Amino acid sequence: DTDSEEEIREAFRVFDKDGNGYISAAELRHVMTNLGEKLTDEEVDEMIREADIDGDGQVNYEEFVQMMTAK
Ligand SMILES: [Ca+2]
Numbered sequence: 001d002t003d004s005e006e007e008i009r010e011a012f013r014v015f016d017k018d019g020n021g022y023i024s025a026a027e028l029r030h031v032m033t034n035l036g037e038k039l040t041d042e043e044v045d046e047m048i049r050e051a052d053i054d055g056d057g058q059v060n061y062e063e064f065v066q067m068m069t070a071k
């Protein structure tokens, strides 16, 4: 709850460039690339796709967490 899950809630919240309240695949490639690491769009696009429960190109913090670790 507030033990540490908070940092996760933050990092992901700030991540949403368009502060839409969720996370899209386009933001990952741009932000990661902007951060200094240029990932692969094919992996990114596929990344969320697998970590998507609603199937709306948008995933909250958890739906993502379970992914962040898994490569
Ligand atoms: Ca988003």
Ligand SMILES: [Ca+2]
Pocket: 051, 052, 053, 054, 055, 056, 057, 058, 059, 060, 063
């Ligand atoms: Ca989803």
